[PDB]
Amino acid sequence: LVPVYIYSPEYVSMCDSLAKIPKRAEMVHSLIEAYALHKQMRIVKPKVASMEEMATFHTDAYLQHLQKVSQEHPDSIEYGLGYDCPATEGIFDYAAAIGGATITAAQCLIDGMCKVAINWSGGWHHAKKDEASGFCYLNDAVLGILRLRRKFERILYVDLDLHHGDGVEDAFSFTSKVMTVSLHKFSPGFFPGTGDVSDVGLGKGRYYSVNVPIQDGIQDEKYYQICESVLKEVYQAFNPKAVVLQLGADTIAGDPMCSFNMTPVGIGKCLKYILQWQLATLILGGGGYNLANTARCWTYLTGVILGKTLSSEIPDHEFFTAYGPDYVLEITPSCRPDRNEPHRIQQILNYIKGNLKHVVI
Ligand SMILES: Cc1cc(Cl)ccc1OCCCC(=O)NO
Ligand SMILES: [K+]
Ligand SMILES: [K+]
Ligand SMILES: [Zn+2]
């Protein structure tokens, strides 16, 4: 009955070893531990993904290339490697560990071990079947969804990262077995450039992709209003049997991305709404580039999952000195404008409502 927490010291070390910002996984776990939340979860060591498991989504050619350059290359550009996804030593084992962790969480859900399974180091939603993209070498979210398909006939993917979950959406673009829902910043020039409200999927999957384009400066109340409106309609139209939820913390006030203006409490309300469906739910991380705030956020959301109220004071622990200048759990929104016009937002919601009328289970 208690949530599964995917964790080992070795796994955290691997996640941080080639993370864009060092020590993020270690800081997230360290804060969860400082609040003693791990004592209220079932700690499960991740299994590393086998080649065959990774190939449920990724092509053999891409996987073999990743494996080769990871060992100590003219093809690497073809596979999306070189810039934001460097071809450095060890990336294949790294990626296989995160993929395996998400698959392990999914397997726990299939086996009925728990109703919620957490991999805060997963959520790499941009990777394509045959190329790295947007810091993502492997798409662990797709791998988790495909593991859940061994049991569940309809899976809802909900992506609350600042960025469009394009890799996951594209993986399931042509099918009605998986509905993808992404709330994200959408503005010409802003990565990855896709996911306008008119993006609804293709072929047999038409209307089984939902995209909510949002502008800079959104705060908790308006975001939750949008999220609840969409998820209410989605739940009613699609009747999912399991959920995968990406909770990238790069929406949170104080992130270097400096785009949305959320706090973990607003994201938490979204999470609570999904949890009250009482479905098998796979919880993932994602972006998040202010280390202390990302730990604040995912620790608070772990508390939400556990139904616990955490002390506002950051406990004494290894990374306490990183939590200045205030040393509290709460995050204060930045003093900058909300650029979301309410009639634009309502227009987007109206479109989505119209699209979901076509969804016929
Ligand atoms: C910030 C950034 C810089 C470069 Cl050079 C290329 C891509 C970038 O953004 C990727 C954002 C990754 C993310 O958080 N996705 O959810
Ligand atoms: K998103
Ligand atoms: K779909
Ligand atoms: Zn992101």
Side-chain angles (χ1 to χ4, degrees), residues 2-19 22-46 48-67 69-70 73-76 79-114 116-235 237-352 354-359:
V2 314
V4 157
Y5 182 57
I6 301 296
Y7 171 79
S8 73
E10 293 79 7
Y11 175 55
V12 159
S13 297
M14 175 66 74
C15 290
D16 281 342
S17 68
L18 285 189
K23 299 225 195 70
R24 197 179 72 164
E26 181 183 357
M27 285 177 69
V28 169
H29 177 70
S30 188
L31 195 61
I32 285 171
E33 178 181 51
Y35 278 104
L37 298 182
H38 61 310
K39 308 291 291 194
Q40 305 171 39
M41 300 187 285
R42 183 179 176 88
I43 303 171
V44 174
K45 175 171 153 284
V48 174
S50 71
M51 192 68 61
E52 293 79 15
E53 288 172 338
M54 289 185 276
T56 59
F57 178 53
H58 292 288
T59 70
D60 279 326
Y62 172 59
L63 292 173
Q64 289 170 26
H65 184 86
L66 255 197
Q67 189 180 36
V69 301
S70 175
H73 198 280
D75 285 325
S76 288
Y79 293 111
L81 304 161
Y83 182 29
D84 52 280
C85 297
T88 62
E89 186 173 358
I91 56 177
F92 182 74
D93 298 296
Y94 166 78
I98 291 169
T102 295
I103 289 168
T104 301
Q107 184 64 44
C108 290
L109 292 167
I110 290 175
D111 289 338
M113 184 173 310
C114 58
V116 179
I118 301 160
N119 178 19
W120 286 129
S121 288
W124 300 105
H125 55 170
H126 300 302
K128 310 187 209 298
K129 65 176 183 176
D130 53 15
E131 57 186 291
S133 184
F135 304 166
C136 303
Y137 300 96
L138 290 184
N139 199 316
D140 67 291
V142 174
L143 295 179
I145 291 161
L146 295 179
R147 175 52 57 101
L148 290 173
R149 287 279 294 117
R150 289 187 177 181
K151 174 165 200 185
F152 302 100
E153 295 283 3
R154 292 183 303 281
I155 300 152
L156 173 62
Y157 174 73
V158 179
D159 188 319
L160 305 187
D161 194 278
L162 179 68
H163 298 92
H164 179 223
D166 62 333
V168 187
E169 178 185 291
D170 290 346
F172 298 105
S173 176
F174 293 91
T175 185
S176 57
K177 300 301 225 183
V178 178
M179 177 174 288
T180 57
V181 176
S182 182
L183 277 66
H184 46 270
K185 173 169 177 176
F186 181 81
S187 187
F190 185 81
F191 190 84
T194 48
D196 202 354
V197 67
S198 53
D199 171 5
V200 295
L202 301 162
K204 291 184 182 323
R206 186 176 165 78
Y207 306 116
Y208 292 82
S209 299
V210 175
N211 286 293
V212 188
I214 300 172
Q215 301 311 299
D216 279 347
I218 195 162
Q219 292 189 37
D220 289 336
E221 176 174 54
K222 184 180 289 182
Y223 189 102
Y224 177 70
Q225 290 176 346
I226 292 169
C227 193
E228 194 214 89
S229 178
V230 170
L231 294 182
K232 184 190 165 187
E233 300 281 324
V234 164
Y235 180 78
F238 184 62
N239 195 34
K241 303 309 271 200
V243 182
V244 175
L245 175 60
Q246 205 272 22
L247 298 169
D250 45 10
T251 58
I252 298 299
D255 195 277
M257 298 279 171
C258 197
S259 288
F260 290 180
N261 196 17
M262 296 293 292
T263 81
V265 179
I267 298 301
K269 287 194 164 66
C270 299
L271 169 59
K272 290 187 190 179
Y273 191 83
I274 290 166
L275 290 176
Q276 53 88 25
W277 295 333
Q278 303 292 343
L279 297 168
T281 302
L282 208 178
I283 301 287
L284 302 174
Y289 305 104
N290 179 314
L291 264 29
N293 281 2
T294 294
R296 284 179 166 94
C297 185
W298 292 342
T299 299
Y300 173 84
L301 300 174
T302 303
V304 168
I305 287 164
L306 292 166
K308 294 298 171 191
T309 303
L310 309 186
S311 176
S312 292
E313 317 301 326
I314 298 292
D316 196 293
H317 74 291
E318 180 54 44
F319 297 99
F320 174 80
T321 55
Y323 287 84
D326 48 282
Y327 306 90
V328 296
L329 184 62
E330 294 77 25
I331 296 173
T332 300
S334 300
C335 302
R336 52 184 169 83
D338 178 4
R339 299 308 193 174
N340 291 281
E341 294 281 21
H343 288 83
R344 215 293 104 123
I345 291 296
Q346 186 61 49
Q347 179 180 37
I348 286 161
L349 296 177
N350 291 346
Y351 281 139
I352 289 166
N355 290 332
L356 286 172
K357 287 307 181 59
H358 298 278
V359 170

